[PDB]
Amino acid sequence: GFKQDIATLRGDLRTYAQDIFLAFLNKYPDEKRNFKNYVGKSDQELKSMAKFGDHTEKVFNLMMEVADRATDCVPLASDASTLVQMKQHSGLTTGNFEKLFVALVEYMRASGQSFDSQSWDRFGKNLVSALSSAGMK
Ligand code: HEM
Ligand SMILES: Cc1ccc(C(C)C)c(O)c1
Incomplete structure (x- = not known):
């Protein structure tokens, strides 16, 4: 898992x-x-x-x-806060993150390995939720 x-x-x-x-x-x-x-x-x-x-x-x-x-694949708000707030993510939007996570999950599904791709997909989704809620566009 x-x-x-x-x-x-x-x-x-x-x-x-x-x-x-x-x-x-x-x-x-x-x-x-x-x-x-x-x-x-x-x-x-x-x-x-x-x-x-x-x-x-x-x-x-x-x-x-x-x-x-x-x-349960739900990141802390404080970590959501950090990502949104980072200077190097000034010009980022949640769509950037969703894409990182589509690829990652795609990567895991195409791997030979027993990665729990279901988890990472929720995790990707739930981070994007939490970036939104911390003020990412
Ligand atoms: C969970 C997801 C992510 C984490 C944990 C993360 C973390 C970080 C960290 C630690 C840095 C600073 C590293 C350094 O300057 O040495 C950084 C910078 C940066 N991140 Fe992210 N990031 C994430 C997602 C993204 C995504 C999705 C993008 C773009 C689509 C992105 C673009 C950047 C850019 C452009 C920089 C500054 C330029 C560069 O680092 O070369 N990040 N991020
Ligand atoms: C944050 C971040 C992510 C990825 C890269 C490439 C090396 C892929 C960076 O320069 C910076």
Whole structure:
């Protein structure tokens, strides 16, 4: 389930983070605009860019935290508060997040692995709910 899937991703977090976030940029090619540094670059090029690797790690380090802290795939409001409030998410909207989570769940469903994709889908949904309620557009 959800809790074991957090353990699984935390076991190879570097590589799960880059692959899922890459799955997101390729499914929604328009999302690369938030990351102009990432335009006209192949996945293998992106994974050799210092900020690509480090920022994607920091994203998933935090993602997993919020996941870890959730009850029944419902994140804390305080963690909703943090994401919305972050300076680096000034120009973001909940649709950005939904897409990250469509890809992630798609990624898990196409994996060979027994990820609890149902959980992550709720979790994605419930984070978007909670970003709305904390004031994300
Ligand atoms: C659960 C979801 C997410 C978490 C936990 C998260 C976390 C973070 C963190 C920790 C940073 C700062 C890292 C750093 O500057 O070193 C950051 C920056 C940023 N995030 Fe997010 N983020 C999330 C979702 C998103 C989504 C969906 C987008 C865009 C669609 C996005 C776009 C950005 C951008 C553009 C920055 C600043 C530029 C950059 O980091 O290279 N984030 N986020
Ligand atoms: C927050 C965040 C997420 C992902 C990336 C790419 C490396 C994929 C960033 O630069 C920043």
